[PDB]
Design a protein around this motif. Sequence first.
Motif, PDB file in Angstrom:
ATOM      1  N   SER A   1      56.521  56.201  -7.915  1.00  0.00           N
ATOM      2  CA  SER A   1      56.169  55.174  -6.943  1.00  0.00           C
ATOM      3  C   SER A   1      54.815  54.591  -7.331  1.00  0.00           C
ATOM      4  O   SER A   1      54.218  54.976  -8.341  1.00  0.00           O
ATOM      5  CB  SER A   1      56.158  55.747  -5.523  1.00  0.00           C
TER       6      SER A   1
ATOM      7  N   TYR B   1      49.107  61.553 -11.382  1.00  0.00           N
ATOM      8  CA  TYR B   1      50.241  62.445 -11.549  1.00  0.00           C
ATOM      9  C   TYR B   1      50.043  63.668 -10.669  1.00  0.00           C
ATOM     10  O   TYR B   1      48.945  64.236 -10.614  1.00  0.00           O
ATOM     11  CB  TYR B   1      50.402  62.857 -13.009  1.00  0.00           C
TER      12      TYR B   1
ATOM     13  N   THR C   1      59.078  69.446 -10.340  1.00  0.00           N
ATOM     14  CA  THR C   1      59.082  68.110  -9.758  1.00  0.00           C
ATOM     15  C   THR C   1      57.718  67.486 -10.011  1.00  0.00           C
ATOM     16  O   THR C   1      56.696  68.017  -9.563  1.00  0.00           O
ATOM     17  CB  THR C   1      59.386  68.160  -8.258  1.00  0.00           C
TER      18      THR C   1
ATOM     19  N   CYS D   1      57.280  64.319  -1.232  1.00  0.00           N
ATOM     20  CA  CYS D   1      56.576  63.056  -1.037  1.00  0.00           C
ATOM     21  C   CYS D   1      55.063  63.208  -1.161  1.00  0.00           C
ATOM     22  O   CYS D   1      54.526  64.294  -0.915  1.00  0.00           O
ATOM     23  CB  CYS D   1      56.957  62.421   0.315  1.00  0.00           C
ATOM     24  N   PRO D   2      54.355  62.139  -1.563  1.00  0.00           N
ATOM     25  CA  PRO D   2      52.961  62.280  -2.020  1.00  0.00           C
ATOM     26  C   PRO D   2      51.977  62.728  -0.950  1.00  0.00           C
ATOM     27  O   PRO D   2      52.233  62.707   0.257  1.00  0.00           O
ATOM     28  CB  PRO D   2      52.613  60.873  -2.515  1.00  0.00           C
TER      29      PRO D   2
ATOM     30  N   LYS E   1      55.482  63.923  -9.733  1.00  0.00           N
ATOM     31  CA  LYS E   1      55.456  62.618  -9.093  1.00  0.00           C
ATOM     32  C   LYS E   1      54.388  61.741  -9.726  1.00  0.00           C
ATOM     33  O   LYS E   1      53.246  62.166  -9.911  1.00  0.00           O
ATOM     34  CB  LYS E   1      55.213  62.739  -7.593  1.00  0.00           C
ATOM     35  N   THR E   2      54.768  60.514 -10.056  1.00  0.00           N
ATOM     36  CA  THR E   2      53.847  59.534 -10.604  1.00  0.00           C
ATOM     37  C   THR E   2      53.549  58.503  -9.531  1.00  0.00           C
ATOM     38  O   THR E   2      54.454  58.057  -8.814  1.00  0.00           O
ATOM     39  CB  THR E   2      54.429  58.834 -11.826  1.00  0.00           C
TER      40      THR E   2
ATOM     41  N   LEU F   1      59.550  61.675  -9.762  1.00  0.00           N
ATOM     42  CA  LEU F   1      59.537  60.845  -8.565  1.00  0.00           C
ATOM     43  C   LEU F   1      58.446  59.795  -8.717  1.00  0.00           C
ATOM     44  O   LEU F   1      57.258  60.127  -8.716  1.00  0.00           O
ATOM     45  CB  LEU F   1      59.308  61.698  -7.320  1.00  0.00           C
TER      46      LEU F   1
ATOM     47  N   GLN G   1      63.956  58.354  -9.016  1.00  0.00           N
ATOM     48  CA  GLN G   1      64.063  59.673  -9.617  1.00  0.00           C
ATOM     49  C   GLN G   1      64.576  59.540 -11.043  1.00  0.00           C
ATOM     50  O   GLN G   1      65.636  58.949 -11.277  1.00  0.00           O
ATOM     51  CB  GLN G   1      64.981  60.586  -8.803  1.00  0.00           C
TER      52      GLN G   1
ATOM     53  N   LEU H   1      60.260  55.394  -4.276  1.00  0.00           N
ATOM     54  CA  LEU H   1      60.081  56.235  -5.447  1.00  0.00           C
ATOM     55  C   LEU H   1      61.442  56.537  -6.063  1.00  0.00           C
ATOM     56  O   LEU H   1      62.351  57.016  -5.380  1.00  0.00           O
ATOM     57  CB  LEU H   1      59.312  57.516  -5.093  1.00  0.00           C
TER      58      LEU H   1
END
Lengths: 514, 76, 227, 47, 44, 260, 93, 79, 57
Positions: free
Chosen positions: C155, C108, C96, H58-59, C98-99, C153, C181, C179
Amino acid sequence: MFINRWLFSTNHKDIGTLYLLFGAWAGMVGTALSILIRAELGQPGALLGDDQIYNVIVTAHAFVMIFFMVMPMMIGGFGNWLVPLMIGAPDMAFPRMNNMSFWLLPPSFLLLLASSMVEAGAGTGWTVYPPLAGNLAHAGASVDLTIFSLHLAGVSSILGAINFITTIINMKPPAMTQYQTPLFVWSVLITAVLLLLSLPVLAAGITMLLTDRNLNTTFFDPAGGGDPILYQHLFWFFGHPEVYILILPGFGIISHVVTYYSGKKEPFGYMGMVWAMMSIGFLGFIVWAHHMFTVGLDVDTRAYFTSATMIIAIPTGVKVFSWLATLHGGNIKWSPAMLWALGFIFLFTVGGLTGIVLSNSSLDIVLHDTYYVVAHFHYVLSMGAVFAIMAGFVHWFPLFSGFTLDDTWAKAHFAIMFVGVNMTFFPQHFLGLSGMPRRYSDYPDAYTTWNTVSSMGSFISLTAVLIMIFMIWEAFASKREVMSVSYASTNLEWLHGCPPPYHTFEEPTYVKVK
Amino acid sequence: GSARMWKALTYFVALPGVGVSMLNVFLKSRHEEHERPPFVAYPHLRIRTKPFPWGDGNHTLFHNPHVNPLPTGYED
Amino acid sequence: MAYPFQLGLQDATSPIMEELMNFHDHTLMIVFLISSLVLYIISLMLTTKLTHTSTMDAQEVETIWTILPAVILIMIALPSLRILYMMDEINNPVLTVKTMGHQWYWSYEYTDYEDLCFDSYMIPTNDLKPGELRLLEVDNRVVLPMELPIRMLISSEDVLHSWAVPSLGLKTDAIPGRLNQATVTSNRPGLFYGQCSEICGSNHSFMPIVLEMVPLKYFENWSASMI
Amino acid sequence: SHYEEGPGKNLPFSVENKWRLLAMMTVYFGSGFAAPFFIVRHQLLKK
Amino acid sequence: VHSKPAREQLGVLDITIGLTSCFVCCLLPAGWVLSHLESYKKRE
Amino acid sequence: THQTHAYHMVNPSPWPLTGAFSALLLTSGLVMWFHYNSITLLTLGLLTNILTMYQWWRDVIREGTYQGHHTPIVQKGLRYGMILFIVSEVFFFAGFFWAFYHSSLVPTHDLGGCWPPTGISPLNPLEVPLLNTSVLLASGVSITWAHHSLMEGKRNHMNQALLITIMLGLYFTILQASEYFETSFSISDGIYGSTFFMATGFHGLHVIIGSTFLIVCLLRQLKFHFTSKHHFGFEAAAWYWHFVDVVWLFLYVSIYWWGS
Amino acid sequence: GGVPTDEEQATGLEREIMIAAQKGLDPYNMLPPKAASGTKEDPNLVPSISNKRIVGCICEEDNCTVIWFWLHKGESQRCPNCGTHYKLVPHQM
Amino acid sequence: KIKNYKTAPFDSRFPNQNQTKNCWQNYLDFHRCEKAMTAKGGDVSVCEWYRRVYKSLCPVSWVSAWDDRIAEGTFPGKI
Amino acid sequence: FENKVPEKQKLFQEDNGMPVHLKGGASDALLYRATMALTLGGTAYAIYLLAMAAFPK
Ligand code: HEA
Ligand code: HEA
Ligand SMILES: [Cu+2]
Ligand SMILES: [Mg+2]
Ligand code: NA
Ligand SMILES: [Zn+2]
């Protein structure tokens, strides 16, 4: 006499005159903005420096070219000249708010100029997507000036739409069926209805954004439970009806010039024409999220929106085939208006098909906000609506002023602007498919060659703008009059003199009893 | 006959209805002496991203010191 | 990576891109069909000489002129729903990623184990080390493994962005508080280049995306070697 | 009658002098094409 | 649409002046700004 | 005798120009009020706009009843245009309800995942909004009784209905201001407070506008301008007030009951 | 008593057409005309306050396109593509 | 359980691209897990899976902000 | 209150040459000069404030 006749005008002929003047001035401003954009995009590097000022330039380009050129040119201008002369009306229904809407327009343009003056600038685009337009990214007044210019243009458009609908469905002769008017009246009627149903939507959205900034509210602030996706929904529920506003009087004008210079006493399939117009009007409101395929919507919603977008694609095709059918069988007089109409047919066809290639949803998941979209709407708008404006402009100019146009120089203008817009707008297919996004002040090495070709074609289009303004001067200076006009038996506007007098239809038309 | 009927409905239904609704609110407003809720500085409430264009920029247009706390608390 | 004199798409690396390009040239042969048809019709009535300005019969050709473009649009639309179902398929999330689009750059996050967040900045033209590409290179690349469906993910922190890698075939808007996907797969290792696609201030053109995908062993070797 | 009508008489500007008409169209369209360039130079001075 | 003869026919010289006249003052402003952008750029 | 068509030829008027420039002053003064804290431009814009509207509708009345230029087909155009105006703010408030429904039907994680958001107690909708909607319904039935008293054609019930409607509308405005003063949240208090206060404020401004319609129609009836068949001023006031009533019913139901 | 009645209240063009409506003759063209018979001996009577008036022949049933042409004072001119007769008469008002 | 896994699975209840609500649900049911087992005396380390799944979804900025909301008493959720 | 409509219906149908926005008397002409003197003065004051926002010190 001057301030009594022109500043306090209450007749639709001079109201359309001042529409035409303001639309020409806005066309000049938008042409200058486009040339500046291409001055960025003809050679790599920061010719200006930052791209925030470039975003200001493209925002002014979009706003001035949409709200101040096309709508005042054909919707306000051509409608205000034509539809009383088209339906036999002596004047518009509410000429006082017609004059109010006209004189509402230059304050909107002045507020946009003040927005460009303010050092923050309107670095947002046509989309005024928060939180870019919020107090943090844009700590200034320029976006507030743009929002208030949208208010001014919106209330002017609402007033004009009310006046147009009232004039169309009220003061036709009483024995006339509503399915018996010329098709420009139908086009501007559906245009005014969609204006009426879509302009309060922008009013709601931009009041929401204005309240979001100035009054500490959280409509699109993520730190207060709001969401910018709501603004995107409202703005595109505006937006696709608005682009159909920018195309429908184009449909009417091109249909009229084709059925005029093609020698037909009637266009092919009038019922099909009106049905297609109302069908794309009805479906224009339920396809607004084809600009929303990458935002993160539900997938079944995306499937419905692309399917309904095909459903809006079909009756436009019915319209195009009816144009080809009414072109069929008729001797073609080679006036420049046919040259504009044929250019409209082919370039609007390829632009709409480019729109379909966008309309496939996963093709927007690869192809959203690239220059492929730029190619789409510059085909269907920057020379669809522009070529329709040109066709109506060179058609009804002997009716508007009394002086004709010389065919050789007018076709020279047509040929140079056709070549210029094709050379400008054909490389962005490769630019978008190769994958550069919009709103860039400098481009990579792969896109350098097609960007240079497009800028060179844009300068060709600028030379065409020069030859057009010279041609307006040449007509107004040579002052050769109109000996006669053909097809005035079918076209009501041409039989009341070139130009028609100040008080037309003082004696109402005797409509047949049947 | 229509105008008489509407006059009768106004006098015998609408005016008594407004009288009963006014009496309901008037009796409630005399019995209810609301316990001002304790101040909690919730991050989603009382958001101030820009000052208001009036007063000190921190009071709302229809501010009421008794019921409307500032981002910092009640004023008393 | 886009090459000069490019007319189509950047060539496929992902199977989803393979079906996108297959459907893309399906739509291109359809549009070329219609364009050639309307060209020949226009050339036919501009090259003709006979005249017919009598009462034209209207209720005979709109039936076919309605039903056969309906067939063309439905055979266009069916593979669109097919590819939408391909994105609607279930996931095998080996990783997973996330950006988080920050103001004029990206961050990142790999947080499945031993949380690490790095910053994708912009390299300048004068500070470009010799041989690179202009307006694309980043000092800190984004490392992925190949041949693995990985969650994306996406956002953004303070302003809207749009994470868009056209070669691999991903484009989703980075929205604050929302966010999205995206399923990232490919078939090859190496560098892949993309851009930000939503207007986001005074360095909108200066946010690229570089993704380097290599064998899993080198991926955890990288992740251990940073920390 | 109440307002003068005819070819070229329904315009807000005079038409009879073609050189004066050329001058006014030149300054009109020149201001139109020069407004955004003076915007960009004004912003360049401001920045 | 038949047209009556030009009341004020333009001579070869008139057309020359007309075409150039605008081109000149419809591109002069553009040239000035674009040509000196680098100076303008100077915060000085 | 110079026109044979039964339509209306408007003499040249300066108030299109001055109203458009007063809108320019209004928007510019809003900019100066928000960013450069000078209220004077906004006050001048308000004065010019209200005075321009006063003389514009003055001239409309003067060409209406003192000259008889509203032909049957002319007032048919008037009622068509008023219907178009009504549906214009129908879609305006429909966009506002779209904003409210997108806020409420899918609450975000910043509100705790529940509607209304936590932290502030919502207002009780059972007493004071019920009094408000009874006020609006009483005013609406008074308007339809007044128009039927025009059909019957007699002044004493006409005047009594108009005064009781104006008193009801003024009472509704005072109660609206009172509940603004007597609420536990502000417009800067969350998405629910923001959309609730903005929607109710736009509706209350429309109620004030409708109260101005009813006041000017009352002063026009007291000056005997209206007649048995040509009473389009009261027809337009009736349609605007019925629009106001149905908008308040929608706002009542949706905001005050759907998730409260 | 009560509100005034427009019959003795309203004056002007509205009053003139109100008198026209009570007397059953419409000279100001608020209603469609009559006498759809355009033979040579019986042309369609077109009333004009001037020497010349625009007429529109709807000369086929459910015809979407109207045929627009003028009449001048004098002999009964025909519709150009069907051939029904029209004669223009001075209204003298 | 005390299972060993790689990443968060594909939750069939939440089949769309928006996973802000997914980490929202993960944070809320991690906290109701923690309060429920410390209330009824169960094992507090049985929803370490829930802690690691919200950490994955989540971030870090959101997580640290929400932990500050817990530390002050400011959290808008139903915890 | 008295029905003063027919006497005001005589003061506006006079074909004296004034337009419909000026037949009422000297009050209307004064009011029209007043709305000219503050709209145009306001517009000139508006473009000065916008220029002052455009050009800092
Ligand atoms: C003139 C204005 C105009 C018109 C008519 C259209 C018409 C259409 N537009 Fe477009 N559009 C814009 C103006 C317009 N648009 C603008 C201004 C934007 C971007 C705004 C912004 O980003 O800020 C935009 C953006 C836009 C996007 C956004 C892409 C993205 O960002 O991801 C999409 C995608 O669905 C789209 C689709 C369409 C479609 C499917 C049509 C159709 O209506 C076209 C239909 C026309 C046809 C001609 C159909 C083809 C039919 C035939 C050829 C007949 C024969 C057919 C058969 C035999 C099968 N438009
Ligand atoms: C009416 C709408 C319209 C028109 C005509 C044009 C015309 C042109 N546009 Fe425009 N463009 C938009 C609407 C329009 N555009 C919009 C809505 C966007 C998106 C903005 C955003 O990204 O947010 C856009 C974006 C846009 C970009 C993207 C900028 C970026 O993303 O970095 C570019 C760059 O190539 C561009 C170029 C051009 C060019 C080179 C022309 C040329 O065709 C200019 C030549 C055309 C004319 C000159 C029109 C004819 C008018 C006259 C000749 C004057 C009229 C007077 C009389 C008739 C008397 N446009
Ligand atoms: Cu659209
Ligand atoms: Mg965007
Ligand atoms: Na550049
Ligand atoms: Zn006939």
